[PDB]
Design a protein around this ligand. Sequence first.
Ligand SMILES: [Cl-]
Ligand SMILES: [Cl-]
Lengths: 124, 124
Amino acid sequence: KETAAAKFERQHMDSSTSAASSSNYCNQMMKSRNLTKDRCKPVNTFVHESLADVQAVCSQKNVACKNGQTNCYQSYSTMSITDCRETGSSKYPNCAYKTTQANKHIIVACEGNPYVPVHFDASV
Amino acid sequence: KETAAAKFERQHMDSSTSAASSSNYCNQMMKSRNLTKDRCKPVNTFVHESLADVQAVCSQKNVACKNGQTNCYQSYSTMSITDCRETGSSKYPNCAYKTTQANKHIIVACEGNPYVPVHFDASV
Ligand SMILES: [Cl-]
Ligand SMILES: [Cl-]
């Protein structure tokens, strides 16, 4: 079974690019990160910063999570992100995503020792 | 019982200002919109655009909702928003919120006739 921290890395980290460079970014990344296996994951955000910078958010601003838990943290700075969301044309096994690049604060839930991101809550 | 559309208006519309003008905006708005009754609502976004502009999003870009439903729409333009989230010092009945102002696309779920916003899904 994948650990929570490793699942967060696979689902939400893309440090290899500064930003989504085209409309096809999401189609490619959702497939390669194995997020379209038996169904299309409807919504997923990738963060274009170093793993260290994203891990560091766990000791930044403590804020509530949408679900009411209190282990969420909001990055002090904006970060480059890409939101991927299914379009109307999306139909498994032919998943189709809209790519929206932005620079926003991220909010992650953190857990464990080491205390690291385990969920992506939202961006602001 | 409050209708879904009216609840969205109360929870998510603040057309009276162009933007959050201070750190105390959220404390004030979460209280006045009755979002701190028996408990502090942990997270809540207000949109600083006209009601018409926000309603119009329901005929803009159709995208998946985080929960996998297909009745979500992403605004073509960015909009002025304020995210309100509880801080560590927040303890009912003394709710306390961090105010984060941003300009982002909004994503809403739409329903009904007229087809209007009934949930705030996320911003990008
Ligand atoms: Cl996500
Ligand atoms: Cl919200």
